[PDB]
Amino acid sequence: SLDLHGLHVDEALEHLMRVLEKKTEEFKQNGGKPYLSVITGRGNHSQGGVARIKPAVIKYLISHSFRFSEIKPGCLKVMLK
């Protein structure tokens, strides 16, 4: 799993983008997983208008047309492009 919990939002998101791109290239040129599991934590709200990691990640995934589902609370399975 890519563990993003507890990070500043902009650094969590940078890692997410970087890693989704790496994993997608690995998926296409090699074998392996068609998904990436991501640990976000369970926090649901922004705080002072600033996304907690879960909303930041999920907003990003929805906005960028990613299919995803929950493996267990705080952990998502994200389908690669």
Which string of x and - marks every residue 28-47 that binds its own copies (by CB under 8 A)?
A: x--xxxxx-----x--xxxx
CB of residue 71 to its own copies, shortest distance in Å? 10
Interface with its own copies includes 75 (CB under 8 A)?
no
Tokens of 4: 């993003």
How far apart (Å, rounded) are the C-alpha atoms in residues 71 and 14? 22
Strands 35-39 and 46-47 turn out to be: unpaired
Interface with its own copies includes 72 (CB under 8 A)?
no
Bridge partners of 37, per DSSP, are 77
State the Rg of the chain over Cα. Answer: 12
Interface with its own copies includes 18 (CB under 8 A)?
yes
Closest to 23 measured CA to CA, from 10, 38, 9: 38
Q: Which residues bind its own copies (CB under 8 A)?
A: 3, 5-11, 13-15, 17-18, 20-22, 24, 27-28, 31-35, 41, 44-47, 49-51, 54-56, 58-60, 62-70, 79-81
